[model samples]
Target: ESVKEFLAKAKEEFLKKWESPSQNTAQLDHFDRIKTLGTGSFGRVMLVKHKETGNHYAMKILDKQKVVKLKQIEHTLNEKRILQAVNFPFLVKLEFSFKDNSNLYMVMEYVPGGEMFSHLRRIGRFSEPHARFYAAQIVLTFEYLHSLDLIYRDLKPENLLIDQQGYIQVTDFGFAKRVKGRTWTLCGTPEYLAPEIILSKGYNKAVDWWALGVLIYEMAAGYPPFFADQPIQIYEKIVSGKVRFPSHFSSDLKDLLRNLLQVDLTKRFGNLKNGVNDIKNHKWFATTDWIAIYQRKVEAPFIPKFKGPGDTSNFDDYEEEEIRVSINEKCGKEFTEF
Candidate 1:
């Protein structure tokens, strides 16, 4: 009875003391502008400096009106939900969020080296060892996500950001969804989309494995396996069930990619009888120390050199602008949970 009383006391007393979300939190003005990191149809991510701590944060600014007008109200809210659930080395960390009169701001850690896409583009292609190192991390990432029944439908180099230590932090959760079974949503980079998704087959977590295979081949070959001027042509090649391996591709690498890129859902690596082990135990990753990889002890193939604080060299340059306007109560009601 005394223990129960103590528990109730802790909740009743501390609940009052700890409730400060509305009263004490970061505001829009707390972040000083730097430059735009990237832009989308409705919003743009900016690199901003926090006023007090001087911490550089990658801020996502989304217009309430634009979010609603584009019919992404649920998606925008779901992004925050998914970001809050994920906590692993390879995934990006969402620090804090605050909203203003007409916008929503998500403050994320500013990974120093920028995107893996830009780095890979500059270096032509990653060496086998380099590819294996990053691939192992991504494997761990999806494995973690899948375990939680979260399907990270979006898997691409642009979403794969690198920290100062050269480790990857998979960012952008606008397309991620939580589901244990099939979910019918045709979303993801065209080249990375699984055949099942292309055909509207109501796909599941296996689509992520398919995307992984495509990404692996791209990392090793310097470009996507399927290439064309339009997405339809790329979809054509994906369902054709043929992967022309590079001459330099090792037997183990090819085997892994072949199984991963399989269109037959039943035979896919992650969805097989033994689940994740079928892919993880493959010869391609035989020498990998899984624990060490997760611990981030493995050194990166290329650590980016920063020219000190506020160096935007890693990220592409873009013009920044203000889109501040009154959303009004009617248009803003959709993002109430945000």
Candidate 2:
């Protein structure tokens, strides 16, 4: 009836999809590439349209060869499963996935508004009210993920997408994993790293809460709380357990930040016995309507303007490249699950 029920359903559905040996469900040839949305270490993401359905989607092309060399098998595989299995308003929807001789592909619903980073930078920072709109959505998103035992280690402006309606949908599941207990992995953006992660103290889902605090600070203040010229300096600043606030931040906002950015898990808001209640009930979010946010009934603070549904103006330009064929059959076998 709710998130937990839906989570249970998705797990069952995930198992069924695996047993059915699903493939050819989404083939590359069926999609006509519209434009290169982005390029990165993995491969590239393109705005594409399905021929028969006349539907637009963001096709994520991952290079299998690069995956092996980078040792991202488990994380990449987790992305595939979680993308397909979960269905939430705040998460990008996975239409289907398929593979070819050279690459793996995930065709996801095209979020037309583009990256939140672009809008955040254009405006230079959000007012507390505006930032609350985005932050509230993420609170629900993290709650949904935590309920599923998943830790979304990555939470930054770049990893968040603004939909056509101006609401946020979290993207890039590369650092997400479902863990039953603490895991000591030094993975995530340097700026968003939790103190425990920097200290290598076998962190758990608490790290996600810490990253959420960093994201909130970045949204309101236009920069991460801990900033320096070098990565090590940033780590040291985080481990130092100090968060300097901008003078413009409201009293409630500063209080919320203090609670979220706390280095000690015992003092951290969401990690405590109150769980997400303390966060949802905080004075900074006093006006927030949780049910309305979850139902997408609240008005978005900003709706992106576009030429048309297919417009790619919000994304950065990138050159397209051909997918390279892998000579190793063994490499292909490892990713057969795709």
Candidate 3:
């Protein structure tokens, strides 16, 4: 087929799957709330089972009043828009999204394997092969997002979860954006913040690559290379590009880390003229069967122990006490509805 023909066909399918809004959208009452998975200032996540399908999904319920009060309306919409636009196996799927008078909800695939952070904390570190396996999957995810002109400002173990099959599933789109060229957003976990972000230099998708390097290091070494007692100190170390490594680190992994952690965005491995190919061709990733990884054929090193779909054992325990949410009747109309 001609290039134009292929492009047109791809766009057609994308519109059919992502842009079409005629699909049956459900409200919060459609699902049976089982248990609270986690909570934050904005809202809380709950493990919910669809009454009709009996399938479990992680429902992220954000308090609309709080989001509006904090003036994060744009960020909230961006999260929903980006999640609706993307459909990748390694990324969390937004099964359904809707809003109510009090809150907005996003129903996503339930990844019961738990956060990679929990596993890293429990195991201290991972073997070289194990780290490579996880990193390879992340590489594919980044490549896809970059192709869509999006920059995932946040990429850390806490935002990555393992699925029932032990494959990686990226979540949390609150900080993601579609940056055609560059985006200026100093919003991300301090430990994983890229130097450009700390420096207030407009950044591109390369920032994600820098965070990936940090993630790989943490997975292989049990902690981030640059750490300090305070945020300012951590930012200083990151900008200075002062990183330490263990003596047992392999030469190939060290080389890959160095290229990825390059303070100069122009020289970053994934941002080079060759783009993602440069990172894929690195010696450290030479053995990665990228096709197999995309197909979910590669085996995961550690799978979370879950008894069933509604199991919350792998997740952190949260308070189950019911709290009242007094809707701001007067102020709700001033904010945009989801």
Candidate 4:
């Protein structure tokens, strides 16, 4: 009974340290929280700035208990760990992860331009070159994530953001996970769900390629091919989804979309797993300056005017919870599972 009491005491201490804001905490007071950027299932993101450096950043605050209860532990942890390792022009960078009070904090590099979803809705599709430019970057990002044996799992307009320079940032890895053999988890926006996924057999990184195909199509056309009013209907449409290119699309783009939307998971590309290079080498990219695209030296099609961190006036009424401090063995790197 004494040993049991000790173990419980230690667990309490561990949780205290685990929840402390200082152990691995981001220096939030140093950075003024200006406004709420976005809100989602378990948390909200804020646009912030470092007081001295004046550097802008996106601060994602997740309720610790809520995140755990929502079954997002694996995905959330992987998001921080993976982003901290993989650096790509198209992928947003995760600077650090820390805890304070009842919330977990993720500090990320800010993309000032705003959500790509807004742009897609306002502009209603894009020209071939512009779409290709964005797709090329996303493909590269997917390539990098695939190389690390990870799957983004989620790819939609909402998760894509452009920075001040108009360079695309694949934000939100909260849904990312490492696929083992194959995963049965049905995740991702319904319209972009892969046919194989809808079938429920199993899926791997090829699912990402399927999503990419869906993404390219949506970028060229304003609406998703399999959109429906209900989830069941959406799933049915995805299973039977056949991609068709608009007459306005060019010959090269039409050819590319055909390959991308191929239904047979394994036979889709009719090539090896590493067929992205083949896609890149396709004739459509013949006119593109691959080097320039890689370098981003060319001026962006659009750029943002950032007055300062305070420009986040668009986001207000953001709520922050209290940070409770105490001593516990669980606070350190030892009890991260909590």
**Cα lDDT computed for each candidate against the true fold:** 0.83, 0.85, 0.84, 0.71
Question: Which residue pairs in candidate 1 have backbone atoms (N, alpha carbon, C) closer than 3 angstroms, thus clashing?
Answer: none
Which of the predicted structures, 1 or 2, would earn the higher TM-score when compared with the native? 2
Query: Which 10 successive residues of model 1 have the least lDDT summed?
Result: 15-24
Clashing pairs in 4: 13-328, 14-330, 17-331, 18-331
Best by TM-score: 2
How far out, in Å, is residue 146 in model 4?
Answer: 1.3
Write model 4 residue lDDT over 270-323, tens digit each, in one string.
135546666777787676665576578766656544564456532335465433
Question: Listing every candidate in turn, what is its Cα RMSD in Å to the true structure after a full C-alpha superposition?
Answer: 6.2, 2.2, 2.7, 10.4
- Tens-digit lDDT string for candidate 3 (221-293): 9999787899999988998966888987899999999998999999999998988989999999999998888
Q: Which parts of model 3 have CA positions greater than 4 angstroms off?
A: 1-24, 321-337
lDDT of 3 at 323: 33
Q: Using lDDT as the measure, which candidate wins?
A: 2
Q: Candidate 3: what lDDT?
A: 0.84
TM-score of 4: 0.83
User: Candidate 1, residues 32-84: lDDT per residue as tens digits?
Assistant: 89899899888899889989898888888888778888887878777876675
TM-score of every candidate: 0.91, 0.94, 0.92, 0.83
Off by over 4 Å in 4: 1-25, 270-274, 305-310, 313-338
Task: Give the better candidate number (2 or 4) by lDDT.
Answer: 2
